[PDB]
Design an enzyme around this catalytic site. Structure first.
Site, PDB file in Angstrom:
ATOM      1  N   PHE A 119       0.861  -1.189   0.000  1.00 50.28           N
ATOM      2  CA  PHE A 119       0.000   0.000   0.000  1.00 50.28           C
ATOM      3  C   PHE A 119       0.893   1.233   0.000  1.00 50.28           C
ATOM      4  O   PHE A 119       1.839   1.336   0.773  1.00 50.28           O
ATOM      5  CB  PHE A 119      -1.004  -0.018   1.153  1.00 50.28           C
ATOM      6  N   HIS A 135       0.706   7.661   2.016  1.00 51.98           N
ATOM      7  CA  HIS A 135      -0.547   8.374   2.251  1.00 51.98           C
ATOM      8  C   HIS A 135      -0.531   9.018   3.631  1.00 51.98           C
ATOM      9  O   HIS A 135       0.320   8.687   4.441  1.00 51.98           O
ATOM     10  CB  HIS A 135      -1.750   7.394   2.200  1.00 51.98           C
ATOM     11  N   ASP A 186      -3.351   9.702   6.849  1.00 52.43           N
ATOM     12  CA  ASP A 186      -4.631   9.080   7.218  1.00 52.43           C
ATOM     13  C   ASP A 186      -5.820  10.024   7.154  1.00 52.43           C
ATOM     14  O   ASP A 186      -5.731  11.220   7.439  1.00 52.43           O
ATOM     15  CB  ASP A 186      -4.571   8.549   8.669  1.00 52.43           C
ATOM     16  N   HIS A 193       3.031   7.722   5.542  1.00 57.22           N
ATOM     17  CA  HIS A 193       3.530   6.367   5.778  1.00 57.22           C
ATOM     18  C   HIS A 193       3.049   5.442   4.676  1.00 57.22           C
ATOM     19  O   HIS A 193       2.139   5.750   3.904  1.00 57.22           O
ATOM     20  CB  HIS A 193       3.124   5.870   7.178  1.00 57.22           C
TER      21      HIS A 193
HETATM   22  C1  OCV Z   1      -2.005   1.391   7.302  1.00 59.49           C
HETATM   23  C2  OCV Z   1      -2.962   0.446   8.078  1.00 59.49           C
HETATM   24  C3  OCV Z   1      -3.863   1.333   8.994  1.00 59.49           C
HETATM   25  C4  OCV Z   1      -3.795  -0.202   6.926  1.00 59.49           C
HETATM   26  O1  OCV Z   1      -4.250   0.782   5.918  1.00 59.49           O
HETATM   27  C5  OCV Z   1      -5.523   1.209   5.898  1.00 59.49           C
HETATM   28  O2  OCV Z   1      -6.302   0.761   6.678  1.00 59.49           O
HETATM   29  C6  OCV Z   1      -5.757   2.300   4.864  1.00 59.49           C
HETATM   30  C7  OCV Z   1      -4.664   3.382   4.985  1.00 59.49           C
HETATM   31  S1  OCV Z   1      -4.733   4.152   6.660  1.00 59.49           S
HETATM   32  N1  OCV Z   1      -7.053   2.910   5.166  1.00 59.49           N
HETATM   33  C8  OCV Z   1      -8.123   2.917   4.370  1.00 59.49           C
HETATM   34  O3  OCV Z   1      -8.034   2.241   3.334  1.00 59.49           O
HETATM   35  C9  OCV Z   1      -9.361   3.643   4.822  1.00 59.49           C
HETATM   36  C10 OCV Z   1     -10.425   2.551   5.161  1.00 59.49           C
HETATM   37  C11 OCV Z   1     -11.638   3.406   5.680  1.00 59.49           C
HETATM   38  C12 OCV Z   1     -12.815   2.482   6.024  1.00 59.49           C
HETATM   39  N2  OCV Z   1     -13.232   1.651   4.789  1.00 59.49           N
HETATM   40  C13 OCV Z   1     -13.990   3.336   6.506  1.00 59.49           C
HETATM   41  O4  OCV Z   1     -15.041   3.334   5.777  1.00 59.49           O
HETATM   42  O5  OCV Z   1     -13.839   3.996   7.546  1.00 59.49           O
HETATM   43  C14 OCV Z   1      -3.039  -1.308   6.200  1.00 59.49           C
HETATM   44  O6  OCV Z   1      -2.979  -1.368   4.949  1.00 59.49           O
HETATM   45  O7  OCV Z   1      -2.477  -2.195   6.911  1.00 59.49           O
HETATM   46 FE   FE2 Z   2      -2.561   4.892   7.234  1.00 61.18          FE
END
Ligand code: OCV
Ligand code: FE2
Length: 328
Positions: free
Chosen positions: A208, A211, A213, A267
């Site tokens: 990933f 980005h 948060d 990150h």
């Molecule tokens: C970086 C960690 C937190 C994780 O990423 C994530 O969770 C990524 C980047 S923070 N976050 C997202 O995609 C947002 C999901 C929001 C969720 N569907 C909602 O409706 O509230 C990973 O990939 O392990």
């Molecule tokens: Fe994140």
């Protein structure tokens, strides 16, 4: 790659009534927020081994049939109401990650925001109880356990910024919080398809991309497999894993409110071929929550940023993150 400075802070005083002890914790939060932007919350009181075991039992027993039946709209056009909550499918040969997202358990069919069909509010979808005994009840109780830790952390961030302890927490309420839990499964795959591996400009293999948060703060449990990296002035640094604590960082709503005093750290997630869990809780306020932006570096505390309602921030932030880094 150098190890990032990610202090372990005992957040237990934030659950109590010793104000001096709480200020000493707030100072640690301030220091970590001004440095790399990350810290591990320890002595948090949540049974994370149980969380990991219950999550593993769910991820390893859900079937393809159930995933379609719980799928968000991006994967199943029949489910037009499911933009946030539900199952996010993997695509064998192309996409390895899969997950399950759920929102406030109080968003029931009779909730006023669900009746008004306000964006970002949805009624959670759950697998069949006989197929996943105890899962829904466990997951709903986990939401309230991590909501309680997040309220305590928000008291620490408020004190750190020179505010009263309820500055953020008064907008973080059980009846309307837009906070979400995501139960992410990153699988071990033999062969691991190259299409599911991204490459950073520096050559690092990622799952990933970079980005900031979309949150006020993010409260994350991860398995003990190193994977996160944070951009600092010295380059991307590795955040060590700690499956006994919660990794905490600020999101862009905090950066907006503090005029970047507490930046949302950039990150990314390295590609690791290992079966692991990433279980974030995104601390979101209510749809109409508005905190007047300020600046703790300025004598009068004033900012040249305009107030932004949390609902607007969230809806547009989630869409932008999908546009930038892809549908998860
Ligand atoms: C970086 C960690 C937190 C994780 O990423 C994530 O969770 C990524 C980047 S923070 N976050 C997202 O995609 C947002 C999901 C929001 C969720 N569907 C909602 O409706 O509230 C990973 O990939 O392990
Ligand atoms: Fe994140």
């Amino acid at each position: 790659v150098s190890k990032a400075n990610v202090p372990k802070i005992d957040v237990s005083p934030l659950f109590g009534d010793d104000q001096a002890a709480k200020m000493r914790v707030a100072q640690q939060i301030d220091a970590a927020s001004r440095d790399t932007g990350f810290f591990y919350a320890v002595n948090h009181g949540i049974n994370v081994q149980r969380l990991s075991q219950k999550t593993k039992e769910f991820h390893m027993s859900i079937t393809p049939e159930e995933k379609w039946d719980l799928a968000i709209r991006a994967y199943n056009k029949e489910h037009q109401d499911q933009v946030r909550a539900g199952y996010y499918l993997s695509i064998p040969g192309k996409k390895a990650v899969e997950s399950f997202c759920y929102l406030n358990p109080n968003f029931t069919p009779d909730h006023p925001r669900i009746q008004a069909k306000t964006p970002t509010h949805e009624v959670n979808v759950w697998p069949d109880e006989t197929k996943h005994p105890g899962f829904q009840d466990f997951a709903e109780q986990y939401y309230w356990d991590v909501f309680g830790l997040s309220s305590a952390l928000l008291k620490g961030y408020a004190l750190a910024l020179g505010k009263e302890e309820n500055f953020f927490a008064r907008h973080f309420k059980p009846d309307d919080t837009l906070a979400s839990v995501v139960l992410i499964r990153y699988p071990y795959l033999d062969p691991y398809p190259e299409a599911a591996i991204k490459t950073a400009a520096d050559g690092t293999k990622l799952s990933f991309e970079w980005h900031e948060d979309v949150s006020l703060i993010t409260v994350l449990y991860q398995s003990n497999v190193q994977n996160l990296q944070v951009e600092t002035a010295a380059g991307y640094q590795d955040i060590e894993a700690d499956d006994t604590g919660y990794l905490i960082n600020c999101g862009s709503y905090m950066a907006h409110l503090t005029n970047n005093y507490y930046k949302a750290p950039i990150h990314r997630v390295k590609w690791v071929n290992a079966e692991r869990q990433s279980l974030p809780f995104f601390v979101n306020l209510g749809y109409d929550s508005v905190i007047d932006p300020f600046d703790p570096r300025e004598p009068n505390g004033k900012s040249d940023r305009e107030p932004l309602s949390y609902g607007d921030y969230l809806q547009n932030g989630l869409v932008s993150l999908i546009n930038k880094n892809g549908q998860t």
